[PDB]
Amino acid sequence: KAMHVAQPAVVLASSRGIASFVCEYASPGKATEVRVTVLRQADSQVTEVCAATYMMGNELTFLDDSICTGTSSGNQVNLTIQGLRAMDTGLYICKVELMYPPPYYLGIGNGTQIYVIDP
Amino acid sequence: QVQLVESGGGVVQPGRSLRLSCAASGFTFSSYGMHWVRQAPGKGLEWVAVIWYDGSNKYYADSVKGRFTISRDNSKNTLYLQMNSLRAEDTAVYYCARDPRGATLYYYYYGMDVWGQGTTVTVSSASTKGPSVFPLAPSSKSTSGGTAALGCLVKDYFPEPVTVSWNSGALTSGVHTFPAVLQSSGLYSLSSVVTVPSSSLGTQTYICNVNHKPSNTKVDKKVEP
Amino acid sequence: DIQMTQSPSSLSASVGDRVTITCRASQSINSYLDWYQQKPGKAPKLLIYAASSLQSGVPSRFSGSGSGTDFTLTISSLQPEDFATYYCQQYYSTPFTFGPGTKVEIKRTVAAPSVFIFPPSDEQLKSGTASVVCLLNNFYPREAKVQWKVDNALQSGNSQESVTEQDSKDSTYSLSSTLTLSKADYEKHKVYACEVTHQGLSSPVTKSFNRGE
Numbered sequence A: 001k002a003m004h005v006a007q008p009a010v011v012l013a014s015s016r017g018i019a020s021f022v023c024e025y026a027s028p029g030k031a032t033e034v035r036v037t038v039l040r041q042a043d044s045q046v047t048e049v050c051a052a053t054y055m056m057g058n059e060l061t062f063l064d065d066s067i068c069t070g071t072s073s074g075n076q077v078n079l080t081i082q083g084l085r086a087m088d089t090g091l092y093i094c095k096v097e098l099m100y101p102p103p104y105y106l107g108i109g110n111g112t113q114i115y116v117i118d119p
Numbered sequence B: 001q002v003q004l005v006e007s008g009g010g011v012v013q014p015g016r017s018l019r020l021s022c023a024a025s026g027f028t029f030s031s032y033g034m035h036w037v038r039q040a041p042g043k044g045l046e047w048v049a050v051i052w053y054d055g056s057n058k059y060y061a062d063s064v065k066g067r068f069t070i071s072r073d074n075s076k077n078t079l080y081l082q083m084n085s086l087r088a089e090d091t092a093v094y095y096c097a098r099d100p101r102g103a104t105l106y107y108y109y110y111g112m113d114v115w116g117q118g119t120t121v122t123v124s125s126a127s128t129k130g131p132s133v134f135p136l137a138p139s140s141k142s143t144s145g146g147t148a149a150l151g152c153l154v155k156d157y158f159p160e161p162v163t164v165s166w167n168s169g170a171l172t173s174g175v176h177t178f179p180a181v182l183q184s185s186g187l188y189s190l191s192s193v194v195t196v197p198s199s200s201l202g203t204q205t206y207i208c209n210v211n212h213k214p215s216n217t218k219v220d221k222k223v224e225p
Numbered sequence C: 001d002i003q004m005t006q007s008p009s010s011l012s013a014s015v016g017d018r019v020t021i022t023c024r025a026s027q028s029i030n031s032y033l034d035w036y037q038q039k040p041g042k043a044p045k046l047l048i049y050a051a052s053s054l055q056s057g058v059p060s061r062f063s064g065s066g067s068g069t070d071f072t073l074t075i076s077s078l079q080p081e082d083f084a085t086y087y088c089q090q091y092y093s094t095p096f097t098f099g100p101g102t103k104v105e106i107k108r109t110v111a112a113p114s115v116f117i118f119p120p121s122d123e124q125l126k127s128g129t130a131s132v133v134c135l136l137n138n139f140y141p142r143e144a145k146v147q148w149k150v151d152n153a154l155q156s157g158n159s160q161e162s163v164t165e166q167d168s169k170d171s172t173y174s175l176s177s178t179l180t181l182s183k184a185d186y187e188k189h190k191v192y193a194c195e196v197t198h199q200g201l202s203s204p205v206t207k208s209f210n211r212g213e
Helices: C183-187
Strands: A004-006 A010-012 A019-026 A033-042 A045-055 A068-070 A076-081 A090-100 A105-108 A112-115 B003-007 B010-012 B018-025 B033-039 B045-051 B058-060 B068-073 B078-083 B092-099 B119-123 B132-136 B147-157 B163-166 B175-177 B188-197 B207-212 B217-222 C004-007 C010-013 C019-025 C033-038 C045-049 C062-066 C070-075 C084-090 C102-106 C114-118 C129-139 C145-150 C159-163 C173-182 C191-197 C205-210
Touching (some): A004 A090, A004 A105, A019 A090, A019 A112, A033 A076, A045 A068, B018 B033, B033 B078, B045 B068, B045 B078, B045 B092, B045 C084, B058 B068, B078 B092, B132 B217, B147 B207, B147 C114, B188 C129, C004 C084, C010 C019, C019 C033, C019 C084, C019 C102, C033 C062, C045 C062, C070 C084, C114 C191, C114 C205, C129 C183, C145 C173, C173 C183
Parallel strands (some): B010 B119, C010 C102
Antiparallel strands (some): A004 A019, A019 A076, A033 A045, A033 A090, A090 A112, B003 B018, B018 B078, B033 B045, B068 B078, B147 B188, B175 B188, B207 B217, C004 C019, C019 C070, C033 C045, C033 C084, C062 C070, C084 C102, C114 C129, C145 C191, C159 C173
16 A cells, blocks of 8 residues: 555644644655655645654754654654644644655645644 | 746757756746656657756656756746657657645645646657648549548658648638658658538639748649549 | 556547546555646646545536545536546656546447548659558548558558547548558559448448559
């Protein structure tokens, strides 16, 4: 089967505006370069929340004052997003792309609905 | 009024090189992935290459790997395709097309939503040649139930295209102008036919108007019994 | 690479028909599939993306479904503007391969061709070459066989065919076949015949002429 990217269906941000979720994926070959992108979908519009490239055998790292922080044990990432406000409520999609060596592969996550309230 | 305009196409000798350009206007070019796709005469679509919005990554069809290079200059709203070591089988219309790649409207919106008009690349050693225009005379063996067939054979020209009209455009119904064929000589040939009332021969004059612009060639041929 | 296949190669339909065509990938591509429409002389147009989402401005009679390896495009009620060729394309993994396309053409009753033959003109003959042209006019369906015979000998490797796009007024096709010979070869023989096979004919029809008669 094709690359599969899975993430929880719903996450609630803490009262401090911090939300965490795992993005885990089943990869085809041995890519040496992987792009991980977090997109927010709402209101027929999409924006990039954060993105990072990882290479070698390193942990996905977001650089530098990003609102996103990550880990990674193999082909998965625990993402943490800070500074969220009520207006940031929406669908957060993890996109994973195998970039190098070719061929390219695309993996789009099912999406995590993040709910945020202003304390 | 999104626009993609290709240029650079033409005749090129086998083994040689060509650069195609695709100029964009009416949208944020630097936000879109761009592709080249080609289509050989009478054949289906074949994907050639893609380049990321910021030029950071590119991928290629296995048939062009090692010979073609895709690039872009976002400061000039322009996409390029450098084609080296060209072969007869690279003959095709080349299209450029944009792709939002999930960066607008929806995160899953991937697809070539706007295409250029195409530019034609003809890989051949042939030299420019105007056509010979021969009559296809109506007769006993081209008449049927009060209708007669007649036409013009437009033979041995290069490159494409030629255009054909009958009686300076006055005669249009019953006209069939066929797609050119490429002969083993490397020159093109086609025919144009029209069926007319068998009555009309000898009283109505029929003339095929043939035009080959790359030759600067204009021909009128009266076709008679 | 990922091989995309499409069925059928061609289908004949009428206005108002529900039409469904299929696309298959040689390995799973999840839902990462586009459908395109193309008409002769024109650039392709995106119809469907992510297997089932409708491109803006595309009529709602168009729908798509599938995920994994098998996909369908459906037109709930075929309209005159929908007669075209349809291509699928995967974008899961590079190269981003197209299917071979499915042509949707207009259905009509079977019509045998009107068959005409044209000897070479004397003008062409004066420069050393002879073209014989056989015309198959206004027939349906498109499939036809044209065999050249010279003094009853089957010809091979010296003829080429051309076929028009389906006519929009009467839904027919026409076909031209051209036999090319040296002048010397043309004069060494007498009887030039075009033999035609087609669904509309109960047995092959021969149109012929005798050189110099």
